[PDB]
From Swiss-Prot, chains A, B, C:
Location of the protein in the cell: Virion
Up-regulation conditions: Expressed in the late phase of the viral replicative cycle.
Biological-process GO terms, alphabetical: viral tail assembly
Name of the protein: Baseplate wedge protein gp11
Residue ranges crossing the lipid bilayer per the database entry: none
Keyword Lipid metabolism: no
Keyword Iron-sulfur: no
Record key words, sorted: Viral baseplate protein, Viral release from host cell, Viral tail assembly, Viral tail protein, Virion
Organism: Enterobacteria phage T4 (Bacteriophage T4)
Curated annotation (Swiss-Prot), chain D:
Organism: Enterobacteria phage T4
Gene expressing this chain: 10
Coiled coil (UniProt feature): none
Record's note on what induces expression: Expressed in the late phase of the viral replicative cycle.
Record's protein name: Baseplate wedge protein gp10
Family: Belongs to the T4likevirus baseplate wedge protein gp10 family.
Shown chain mapped onto the complete sequence: 252 to 452 of 602
Compartmental location: Virion
Role description: Peripheral baseplate protein that is part of the tail fiber network. Connects the short tail fibers to the baseplate. During infection, the baseplate undergoes a conformational change from a dome-shaped to a star-shaped structure. At this point, gp10 rotates and acts as a lever that unfolds the short tail fibers, which then interact with host cell surface receptors. Involved in the tail assembly.
Subunit structure: Homotrimer; disulfide-linked. Heteromultimer with gp7; a gp10 molecule is disulfide-linked to gp7 and the other two remaining gp10 molecules form a disulfide bond. The gp10 trimer interacts with gp11 trimer and with the short tail fiber (STF) composed of the gp12 trimer. Part of the baseplate macromolecular complex which consists of gp5, gp5.4, gp27 (central spike complex); gp6, gp25, gp53 (inner baseplate); gp7, gp8 (intermediate baseplate); gp9, gp10, gp11, gp12 (peripheral); gp48 and gp54 (proximal region of the tail tube).
UniProtKB/Swiss-Prot annotation, chain E:
Species assigned in the record: Enterobacteria phage T4 (Bacteriophage T4)
Family membership: Belongs to the T4likevirus baseplate wedge protein gp10 family.
Protein name: Baseplate wedge protein gp10
Self-association and partners: Homotrimer; disulfide-linked. Heteromultimer with gp7; a gp10 molecule is disulfide-linked to gp7 and the other two remaining gp10 molecules form a disulfide bond. The gp10 trimer interacts with gp11 trimer and with the short tail fiber (STF) composed of the gp12 trimer. Part of the baseplate macromolecular complex which consists of gp5, gp5.4, gp27 (central spike complex); gp6, gp25, gp53 (inner baseplate); gp7, gp8 (intermediate baseplate); gp9, gp10, gp11, gp12 (peripheral); gp48 and gp54 (proximal region of the tail tube).
Described function: Peripheral baseplate protein that is part of the tail fiber network. Connects the short tail fibers to the baseplate. During infection, the baseplate undergoes a conformational change from a dome-shaped to a star-shaped structure. At this point, gp10 rotates and acts as a lever that unfolds the short tail fibers, which then interact with host cell surface receptors. Involved in the tail assembly.
Amino acid sequence: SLLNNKAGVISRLADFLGFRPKTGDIDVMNRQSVGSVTISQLAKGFYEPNIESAINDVHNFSIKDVGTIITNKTGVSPEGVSQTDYWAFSGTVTDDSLPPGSPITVLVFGLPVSATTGMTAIEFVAKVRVALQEAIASFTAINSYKDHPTDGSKLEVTYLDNQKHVLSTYSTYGITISQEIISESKPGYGTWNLLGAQTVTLDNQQTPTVFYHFERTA
Amino acid sequence: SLLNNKAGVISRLADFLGFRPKTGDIDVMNRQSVGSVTISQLAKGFYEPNIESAINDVHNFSIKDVGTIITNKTGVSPEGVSQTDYWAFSGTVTDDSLPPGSPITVLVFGLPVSATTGMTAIEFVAKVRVALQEAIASFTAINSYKDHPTDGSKLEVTYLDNQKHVLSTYSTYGITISQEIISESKPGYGTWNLLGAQTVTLDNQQTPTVFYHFERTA
Amino acid sequence: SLLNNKAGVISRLADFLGFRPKTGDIDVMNRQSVGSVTISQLAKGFYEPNIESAINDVHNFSIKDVGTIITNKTGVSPEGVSQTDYWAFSGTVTDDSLPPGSPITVLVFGLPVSATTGMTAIEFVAKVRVALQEAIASFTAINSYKDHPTDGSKLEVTYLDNQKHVLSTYSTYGITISQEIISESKPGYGTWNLLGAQTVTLDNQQTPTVFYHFERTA
Amino acid sequence: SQWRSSYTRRQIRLLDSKLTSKTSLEGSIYVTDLSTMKSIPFSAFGLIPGEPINPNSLEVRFNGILQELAGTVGMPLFHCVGADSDDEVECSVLGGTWEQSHTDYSVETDENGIPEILHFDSVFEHGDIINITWFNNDLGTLLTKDEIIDETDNLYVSQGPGVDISGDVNLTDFDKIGWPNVEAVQSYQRAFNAVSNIFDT
Amino acid sequence: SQWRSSYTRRQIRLLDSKLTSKTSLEGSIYVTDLSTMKSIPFSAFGLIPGEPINPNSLEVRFNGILQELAGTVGMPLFHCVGADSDDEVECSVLGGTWEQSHTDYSVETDENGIPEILHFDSVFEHGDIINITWFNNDLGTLLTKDEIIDETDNLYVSQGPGVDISGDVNLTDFDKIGWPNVEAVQSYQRAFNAVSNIFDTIYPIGTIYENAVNPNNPVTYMGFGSWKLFGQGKVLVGWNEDISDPNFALN
Amino acid sequence: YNASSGQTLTAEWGKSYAINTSSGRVTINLPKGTVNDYNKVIRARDVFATWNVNPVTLVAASGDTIKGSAVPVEINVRFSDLELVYCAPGRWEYVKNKQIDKITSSDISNVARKEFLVEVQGQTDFLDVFRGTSYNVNNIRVKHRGNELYYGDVFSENSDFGSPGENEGELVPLDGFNIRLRQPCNIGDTVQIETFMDGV
């Protein structure tokens, strides 16, 4: 069956990537299944329930309107936290297909780094700084970077999103490129605000319990 | 590497489209990663973590059970809002591959509209009304349409979902088809109910703060 | 256009499957669109917004931190519920390409079951038990199975996830394999705890309303 | 200069239902409900009046995707497992009524001398595109004698020896038949190429 | 005379801009800004001085996908829907400027020998693979002994099934014809090798033939058989196996 | 004739045709049976060249050939113009290689070479000449690196050529496929044979 299975996708573009919708799913406006075909992809010709709509639906589901109070006893603001990492670099830049001091590009965790053969990790990092600027300048997956304080061959790295990012250590051109995770990212979205503490004695409890009301500021 | 990369997909059917699962993801029943392979696709033969399961998981995550109280100071019901738009039409239906008054089909934002050559936008819209009925009758991306009150060449349009829908203006067969967004869609799901207002003085605040408790009615 | 449309996907691997990001989407750290390209796929070379990031974003959105109070009047813990099902089996194992008592493998809802020709559903189920162990041992989509108490040809089945699983009845090798859904799965994630009941009289109500505060224990 | 090449490619792009506005045209437009009609006939493709797919060779492709659709023959066989209503084994029908597949997966091509018609079964998105392969058929023919000279006798009869006919007569008069109106005929061999030779003999 | 190529083939791999940092090599490496330059000139593919292809039948593919590129011809055509800035049809500029796509989507082959530059417009991922397969000579197909067996099928008329003959009889005297002098024939097969075989089944011995006008022995105009004049001044009348028929039962 | 109308066309003797193959193939089918008429040119061409790209498809219907084996001819030639008359030996003339701006004219016969390194002595003949089809007798080509003498209009003892596999002496007629030579030659003394052949 792989034939007409492999037939499949055509256009990529998850707009155009189909989705078996949830059977009996009203969760959208009490109306339709998540991922149901939308006027976006209709205009684009794609007539089937799709991956695109499924993302925005649950997205539109998990996003509470501004000003919504989140309440907990703990008191951590719902706001997400980005992951912050180190990128540990080592070795000397080496290209045996070019003479020493040969400008090349090196992809650091997918970030191109222009460097010349013979650069140690530090000079490599010196170039890595250039790329990370673009990674910030292009705002691609990297919120910010910072030079490792005691090490030139490491760089403190911050990611745009609140997701978790785990990458694989590799060594290119005599330069080992490894990611050292510093801070875990935390779930959340938007900007939130603690209103304050509410102490509450539950109905037949003896003990008053404290709550923390988190308004959405964004 | 694009070879075995392009090797890839086979069967489309996001059930069968793989997903690199989240590493160390218990968020499903405190058990497995989001998008982990499910008995659905096992039965279908697909043995890998997939896009299907990943959608329903976070879907099943972002859906609070009926009767759950959402509380805010603002007071907007969590319930989603569909987008409502105008579709602005202009020109006269024109097919130079057929004589005048030649019935043809016109895709309006992906909706086929049977119209004959020579119809102005209004007569075109007259036919567009027929298609929008089906778009409602088929319940595809369009919650409802309404004739533009002062313009026959425009139509007030409502979408099934609560997502945001932005489409591109195009002109086919001497008929310009453009979407004019009227109302923004708002995040939310199900049917919700404000219980009422709770004024709360926080622990060391002087100022009582009001809350609005939104029960889920669906 | 299907040409460059079909051009499309290359590498599968929803990391590498693109996503049209949401226009003007800050919901990630008040920063970027859901599904925006991440350092994961950058390292993997994929430079486009993708399906991977879109799942974790809304995932990271719909996951409230441990200790968060969910409050309802109803009192059902937010914790998800897995689906539990029967798998009804019938007939005698039959392979006409092999002599009787011929060990073969049978895929039960995608689970291979080694069985020899001539086994009735019960002996088939006897083998099905072996596979379900692996399905549990491999922890693939099946939380647990249990023998149908009054029927050897049925098996009580439990799924890992909290999603909904509906499968199609089929008959292979003279063995009909059908799924009988027992318990519906319920939305939720993590481990939650009811703090207790809070009776609240709303601002101008006469009637005190009770709430149930659900802390996240996981 | 160019040697060129000896071969042809063919294609269709079909759009479904009303959405076309445009009837099936040459191998350019095809219109239908994809749901309704499985396969396609080809006049809806590019056609020279003859020689589709030298029968030892076919590549028919859709989307941009490249697979053996041909003839609804397959190495999996599964002429059973074509199996609308999805019963897996034994071809015996269970549950929903099961069908031994007339056309198992994708392209079938019926016709004899060449396959004037193709059949096919799959479901597609609204727009479809097809790709088609016609090799040069012409040449291969073989084998010399000693086997084919043994091939004739046990099987296909033979012409045997031809017979001179000295006793034939022809009718000079077709209303009142025969004598006096008759003509003796000169002698002639009868070698039997067809049954008419036989029939008259 | 040149015998040229007989197939061969080409494929190109480019990576964009600095990511290569290296220039194009033969048909192996290519380099450019991919969004800046649509199409290709090909010296980019490996070039050898035969004029390579039938430009008509041209396999031009990218990724691993068979796709119809060369010429910016397509059976849908739509040069007017080349139409960048999504001005849909009718060639009149609406919204952004529409313009006629001289190069419609994919490849537009060019001028005299072959495309001199294949003129392509579509987006790629920076690492490229483009399948260029340009045939010469031909393809024959070869089958063994089935032709000579399957091809004569409509040619000849086959023996078909062979029949045993249990009923045949012969004249034990050819002067006086008929019973008492008759001899039945033992079982043996007739597999019809030649016409005479056919002839004996259609005219078994004792068959009564009548030609209207021809006085000649049938073997003269037929070519087969030993024939005797028969029933002169005699009518043929059905003989009865019911003995009660006084004349036509008993002989 | 539009490329848009049909992908084929047919049959008007004295009517002259610009050919569009752009929209798609053009398969031309000329009249047939033609009696004794001959005398009749038909005209197809490229005003604009859509030949190359999507070319001609020229189809004579069975019967009288245009040239050779009557299989449908195709023209890559970018510009082209087609002058073809029905020619009394049941033939349709075709002007060889031609277009506007360009003289491609006439025809190119075909020479190929195959050297025979002689071994083993013996070797007074060589079979099949060039493996496919036949040798073209009229121009004999064989070398010892001394280029061997004519086969000749009159096969002679003077002419030193065996001609295929003759029982004794050597065969007076020459045959394309197999050749023979009066000489054993010598190993390493190379018999170097060529043809001037009509088709490749």
